[PDB]
A = this chain, B = another copy of it.
Amino acid sequence: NPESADLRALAKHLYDSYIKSFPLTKAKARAILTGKTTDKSPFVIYDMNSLMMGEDKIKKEVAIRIFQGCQFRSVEAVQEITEYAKSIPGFVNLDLNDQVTLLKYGVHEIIYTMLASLMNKDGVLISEGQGFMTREFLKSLRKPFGDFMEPKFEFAVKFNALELDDSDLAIFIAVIILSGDRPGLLNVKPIEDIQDNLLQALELQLKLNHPESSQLFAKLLQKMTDLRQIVTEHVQLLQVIKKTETDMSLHPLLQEIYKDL
């Protein structure tokens, strides 16, 4: 069909921009985690000793240092997601204020989606897959900090059972950015016309790439409720840390995103 064909070209375009925007793809993450010979095995951090050994190999309190580590990686992800968003057709043509709103609300939902790529049951890849930090070591951190990652692992284990690949995820993250139910949006209709087109492209991609996977489209859109709950839970955890650690700085970029969310 002429219309299918425009949907495949949109899918190829977004996958292309996704590869160019995100240095560590799920395909590379899965090669490192499942020990494929295409990639180097990571140094594993499971305790204080392996952590300090990590400083040497992969290149102030421990819970805090790991937390600032996450923080900076989040800032980097925000920069890669903002560069991907510019590639989404129509996005840069929107009201500048709506561009800002779509990024502010969308970026955390995208971070937890793509963070699932780097996770299994037992832990998470770090320093572009040169390291692996165990889930158990993260859960054993000091009182406020030991709970930060657990909800991300729980989402990730469920999300990964969908067995999406990068070409699926490129279209899904574009659908997330182009919501239009986000608060404070000036012109909802230009946003929903783009989301509509992205949702058509996602639906055909999943039919073609997962022809045996019944209602994968609906099952993936339902996962949007889990992303919203991880974001809401994470923000109220940051409100606790702000108050118990008055000496701990937050990046302004993260601060501007969380501002009246």
A residues neighboring B (CB under 8 Å): 158, 179, 181, 195-196, 199-200, 203, 214-215, 217-218, 221-222, 224-226, 228-229, 232
Name the B residues within 8 Å of A195 (CB-CB).
215
Residues in B whose Cβ lies below 8 Å from that of A217: 218
Residue from the list B200, B203, B215, B228 in contact with A229, Cβ < 8 A = B228
User: Contacts A158-B181, A221-B222: A214 and B196 contacting too (C-beta < 8 A)?
Assistant: yes
Q: Within the complex, which residue of B179, B215, B221, B226 is in contact with A181, where a contact is CB–CB below 8 Å?
A: B226
Chain B residues, CB < 8 A from A203: 218
Which residues of chain B are near A215, meaning CB under 8 Å? 195-196, 199-200
**CB nearest neighbor in B for A193:** B214
B residues in contact with A200, CB < 8 Å: 214-215
Across the A-B interface, give the 7 residue pairs with the lowest CB-CB distance, nearest first. A221-B221, A199-B218, A199-B215, A225-B225, A224-B225, A225-B228, A196-B215
Out of B158, B221, B225, B226, name the residue touching A218 (CB < 8 Å).
B221
